[PDB]
Design a protein around this ligand. Structure first.
Ligand SMILES: [Cu+2]
Ligand SMILES: [Cu+2]
Lengths: 340, 340
């Protein structure tokens, strides 16, 4: 009953229902644990999936926390921790996996949750939980690349893989070469930094940072010592490291955005497609304008001048040498704690 | 008129008392118009000057306005239009010079005032007056360079001239070469813009501008159409022309001061000495710190914070799209009037 090892299976093939069996194992899930769609074909499922496996994993039925908030984001929708609504949803699902009394009940709770939740969100929240619970330390989480390649690779290679896997028997299959320097041509000097910007290691680093220092969740997960300063310092070392690369590609140091009104010159077309959402990360044209936001579904109604305002407030607070509490009390930006 | 022309004789030899020869003329000064030092030896003075001269000018003794505010800046002190106290003093003098009914009565006021007031301030205040009185219009005022060379040339030439004039009779004298690129060596890249920054024409421009669009003074003189907009535009075109020159001396576009806390990289030592004040314009060392001011004589007590507060306020209005009146009313920064 190595729950720990069995939890790792929940990362295998995130869009495949859990009853299809991961690695060499299958879960034996209660009938009320199946979704409404697949409950009717329960018998057939057992037949193929259930029988072909070496290890069958019994899941004990339990009473389940309220999963509405985490289910409220759609299975074919996109997931961003930058959008407040999604942060709030993730925070809650994290609390739920943190709060299970038992590593066995975590297994049972996750098995239930998995095919009812957005896979990206499931990966995030489950990961943050496994990294923080006492009973799930020392656990070798799969790289996000390994389980969601769609966020890391030219969308063109998926059919190249689909074909190779389908036509060629495995022992004979050729590795697929991942394109590099593929997002832009020589006419865009910015393409020179492909090896920094589009390197799975640095993007994983950015992702890992939001796994260890999430912005909303249980106190235990959020409140790390000096996390406000690490935020500053990490983003600051990235720019230092990014400028080092620029100097090595005959470019200038990177220039801040002048303001939030003038166009952004450098466009970008990522060439990524999401197999979860079956929708792209739309590129941004050259010379695009920042526009007032009214995203009803995302729950974002915010003008550019609302952003201008926060920045102004923040600059006033930096110049004053203190921030003002929600009550009106002064907290000094001293030498020890000001940066945090 | 002849009175117009006599007013111009007041610009001749600024620190030489007005009873000494001006041009080919002399003023006949009512005894009580002499200063304290020279009233007692008034008789031994009238004989000692002017008998060489062709015209002699009668000055009518008249009742004069209260002259103590203009007098409060000392004759051997420096004069600045940026300093609020000095700006107020000049406004009062300007007021006086524009409040005389006749061009004759103006001659009398100026004649009296000259040897009692700071020469820089007198030249300034009279000059503004003459440019604006309805009865002294279209006057060819003499160039400031000619009257106050000490604001415009390396102080090393002053003794060169004094020698050449003292030793060599006027028929035989040769021209003094004014050094160029004299403020800094090629160790400093900024030195390359000597021909712009230290150009007499350009400096005269800056000066003439502040004579036509003075910021304090009588309403008649200050309130010009769209002068707030001129101020922006005039300063915007200076940067533009500067940048052009920078692009022609292998330099980059000028960089804003980032803020008021960072040291100023670029030092500057002007090699000018004021003969009116017998003091220098002190240089500024490289990497100098802007410091809080407590200059009591100048009546300035201002912290770098006070300036940063003003700047934050102005940024807040611009983003708001309106400023707020002393009475609490909003005035909108619209497409026509906003810049002004
Ligand atoms: Cu980040
Ligand atoms: Cu100016």
């Amino acid at each position: 009953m190595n729950y720990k090892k069995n939890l790792l299976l929940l990362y295998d093939r995130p869009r495949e229902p859990i009853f299809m069996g991961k690695g060499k194992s299958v879960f034996d899930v209660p009938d009320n644990y199946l979704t409404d769609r697949y409950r009717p074909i329960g018998p057939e499922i057992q037949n193929r999936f259930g029988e072909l496996a070496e290890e069958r994993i019994p899941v004990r039925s339990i009473a389940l926390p309220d999963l509405r908030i985490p289910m409220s984001l759609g299975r074919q929708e996109q997931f961003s921790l930058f959008i407040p609504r999604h942060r709030k949803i993730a925070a809650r699902l994290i609390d739920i996996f943190m709060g299970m009394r038992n590593i066995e009940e975590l297994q049972s709770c996750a098995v239930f949750a998995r095919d009812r939740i957005n896979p990206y969100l499931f990966n995030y929240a489950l990961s943050v939980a496994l990294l923080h619970r006492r009973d799930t330390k020392n656990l070798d989480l799969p790289s996000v690349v390994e389980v969601f390649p769609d966020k890391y690779v030219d969308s063109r290679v998926f059919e190249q893989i689909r074909e190779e896997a389908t036509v060629v028997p495995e022992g004979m299959r050729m590795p697929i070469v991942i394109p590099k320097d593929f997002t832009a041509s020589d006419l865009d000097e910015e393409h020179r930094l492909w090896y920094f910007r589009e390197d799975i290691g640095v993007n994983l680093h950015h992702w890992h940072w939001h796994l260890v220092y999430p912005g909303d969740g249980p106190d235990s997960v959020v409140r790390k010592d000096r996390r406000g300063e690490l935020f500053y310092y990490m983003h600051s070392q990235l720019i230092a490291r990014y400028n080092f690369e620029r100097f090595c590609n005959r470019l200038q140091r990177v220039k801040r955005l002048n303001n939030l009104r003038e166009p952004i010159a450098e466009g970008y077309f990522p060439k990524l497609d999401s197999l979860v959402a079956s929708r792209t990360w739309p590129g941004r044209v050259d010379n695009a304008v920042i526009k007032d936001l009214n995203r009803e579904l995302d729950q974002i109604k915010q003008d550019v001048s609302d952003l201008e305002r926060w920045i102004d407030r923040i600059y006033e607070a930096v110049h004053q040498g203190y921030v003002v509490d929600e009550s009106g009390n002064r907290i000094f930006l001293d030498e020890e704690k000001g940066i945090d």
